[PDB]
């Protein structure tokens, strides 16, 4: 299980959540694959503290290194019913 909000650390604020819940984000199972480097740096935030979870998040799933799978999760959402 894997999923992403506000309140699961002392830095993120329910004003951001918005953010993410307007361009339809994934859980945190697509932060992996976000920019979150950027994003990181454009509101200041660090960087540190987020591949620190990731890093215990992967850890526990297996003790050896491992790629995941990122199957693509990209819809077009076009020439859909405006009416």
């Given at each position: 299980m894997?999923?992403?909000?506000?309140?699961l650390?002392?830095?993120?604020?329910?004003?951001?959540?918005?953010?993410l819940?307007?361009?339809r984000?994934?859980?945190?199972?697509?932060?992996?694959?976000?920019?979150?480097?950027?994003?990181?740096?454009k509101?200041?935030?660090?960087?540190?503290?987020?591949?620190?979870?990731?890093?215990v998040?992967l850890?526990?799933?297996?003790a050896?290194?491992?790629?995941?799978?990122?199957?693509?999760?990209?819809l077009?959402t076009?020439?859909?019913?405006?009416?």
């Amino acid at each position: 299980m894997g999923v992403l909000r506000v309140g699961l650390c002392p830095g993120l604020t329910e004003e951001m959540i918005q953010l993410l819940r307007s361009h339809r984000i994934k859980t945190v199972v697509d932060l992996v694959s976000a920019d979150l480097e950027e994003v990181a740096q454009k509101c200041g935030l660090s960087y540190k503290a987020l591949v620190a979870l990731r890093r215990v998040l992967l850890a526990q799933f297996s003790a050896f290194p491992v790629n995941g799978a990122d199957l693509y999760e990209e819809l077009k959402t076009s020439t859909a019913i405006l009416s």
